[PDB]
Every structure is written in structure tokens, then in C-alpha cells.
Amino acid sequence: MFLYNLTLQRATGISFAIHGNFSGTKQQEIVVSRGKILELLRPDPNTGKVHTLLTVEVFGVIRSLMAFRLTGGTKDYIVVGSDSGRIVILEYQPSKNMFEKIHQETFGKSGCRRIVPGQFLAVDPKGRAVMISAIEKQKLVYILNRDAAARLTISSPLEAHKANTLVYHVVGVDVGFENPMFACLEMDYEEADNDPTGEAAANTQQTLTFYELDLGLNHVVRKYSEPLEEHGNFLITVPGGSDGPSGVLICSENYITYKNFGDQPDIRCPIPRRRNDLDDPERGMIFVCSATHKTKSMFFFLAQTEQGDIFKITLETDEDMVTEIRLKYFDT
């Protein structure tokens, strides 16, 4: 029974979205993952309607997307993490209406594997470095450089592997033009595996670890690591340098916490609940996703709860120190 497969209706569900000047022009597009398909969208700022410019079956499981830009560049690259086990960088070519594969670097076997990288993708804001991280143990960092011709160049991967470590999320920290840093929410599971009582599992704490890439010495150092009060589900990169105070918001169960390395104290804000909520009181509340808006003189985050309620989040600063997190309810 020989058979021919045809798609009639492409998948419509979205699992990742990134925004950027993928065309290399003033206007912004959105690249969306539909799991098996990569798609480019243009919202028309006049008509409001959203136009699908390009759809490509990638015959793989997309697991992470990041936009990134080399310092000085006009155009955003798409870096893709997938079940393939190869880190792929794409450039949208507006003239040919195609995604062009600028680099493909190989680091492991294929499938949605536990210890092979691809699930988590973090890029330095300046675009200097990209870190691809597996759920467990294996994390790899690729340095990014611009050649004379302005074509993209990918450095050989630098190993940053810590055994028995589960990673919940990784984000690039904005350090301005200092050495790139990545932040990971990680839990070490070695003690739970060796404790017959189960106390070790209960007393295992997630840590926030900052891995710094010393660009000069080509090595990745696990420079700071710190236990959190409660388990975070994801991280948000806070604007750094001139733009902001740097650091990373941890979204966690019932809370949002701001952390930075050095003299910066922890600031923690509870997630506001709905008045008269009919929900089961045993249920905690998490933020499910976030967007950042960075503007010429200010920034804010939008973060959405499990109920669909969006909070605008702002950070008050005195000198370069955050002093409070402010949450205004925005919309549902």
C-alpha cells in the first residue's frame, strides 16, 4: 500500500514567536514556530491585518528560537534550536522570499534527547555569543563574530557541562559591552538520587547561576551560583548598561523576584490575585510568558498569568540599583 502524504491545511498552532527586522528594514516582522513549520509574519501597521510572507516545513521539531543582531548590523538573524542536534542560523532573504542557512554547526545525535542541547536557546543581547543548553548536564556556547565581508562567522563550541544538573530556563544577561553572561535556573539532582529517605529531594533548592564567557581566554566560567527561596519557572532579561540596571527577573510560584550579582539586594513582589476568584485556593499562580518593551528613555515588561491576566512590570532604580518592582494590571 504505497501512499503519498499531502498537507491541505498547515498547522496553525504557535509554540514560539520572535520579533525583529528580519528583512533588514525599518519595519518589524515576527517569526513563529508551529513545531514542524517555520513561518514569517508581517503585521501591517496601517491595515492591522497580519500577512504570512513565507511558510517552510522544516521536517524537524523546533524547540527554541531566538532573534539576534551583530553589533552595528541592520538586520536580525534567526538562530534555531531543534531535535536535529545541529545549531542552525538563518537569514531571511527578502528578495528571494526564502530563509537562507548562514551556519549549521553540529554537536550531537538527533531526537528530543535529555542530555543533547537544543531545548533551551539563549543569545547575548549584543549578539556576541549564543548558548544552546540541554535540559540536563550539557550546555554549549558558540561565539559569534562579523567578518570583513560582513558575513556571519560562528566560533567552535565551548563546553559548559555540569553533571546531575537540570536546567529550567537560560537567558542571556545584558552586561553591555562587558564579557557575555548567561543566567540559568538549575537544580542539582545528585543527592536526591543517593538518599533513601527522600529528604534530599525535599531540601534540594534551585539555584540561579551566572555563567560568564571570558571572550579573551575562550572559556566559560560558572562565576556565581545562588539558592532561590522558591522554584522559578522562567527568567526575563532586564535591559543593561545605559538602557537599564541589568540583572534578571525570576518568575516563580506566586512571586516575581529581581536579582543581580554584586551589591544588589533581592527585591520580591507577590503576583496580585483576582478579587473574588472562584479558583481552587490550593492553586499557586505562575507567569506563563513575557514580552519586553525597550524604549529610548524607559523599559517595561508584560507578563501574563495562567488566567490570561497581563501585568505591566516596571523597575524603580536609585543609581544602578533596583529598589522596587511595580506591577500594574494591564489587560486580560
Report which of 192, 190, 63, 191 is spatially closest to residue 135, judged by C-alpha positions: 63
Please, which residue, 45 or 281, has the CB nearer to other proteins?
A: 281
Quote the least distance from Cβ 97 to other proteins, whole Å: 9
Q: What is the DSSP string of 294-306?
A: EETTEEEEEEEET
The CB-of-191 to other proteins minimum distance in angstroms stands at: 10
Q: Three-state DSSP class for 112? A: coil
CB of 310 to other proteins, least distance (A): 14
Are 330 and 313 in contact by the 8 Å Cβ rule? The answer is: no
CB of 217 to other proteins, least distance (A): 6
Nearer to other proteins, 306 or 324 (CB): 306
Distances (CA, A) of 173 to 69, 115, 203, 326: 15, 24, 28, 21
Question: For residues 116 and 325, which CB has a smaller minimum distance to other proteins in the complex?
Answer: 116
Give me the least distance between CB of 110 and other proteins, in Å please.
Answer: 6
Between 20 and 117, name the residue whose CB sits nearer to other proteins.
117
Say how far apart CA 320 and CA 191 lie, in whole Å. 38
* Least spacing, CB of residue 71 vs other proteins, in Å: 5
| Residue whose CB is less far from other proteins, 191 or 316 | 191
By beta-carbon proximity to other proteins, the closer residue of 202 and 318 is 202
Q: What is the DSSP string of 155-224?
A: PPPEE---TTEEEEEEEEE--TTSS-EEEEEEEE-HHHHT-SSSHHHHT---EEEEEEEETTTTEEEEEE
Question: Distance between CA 155 and CA 212 in Å, rounded?
Answer: 16
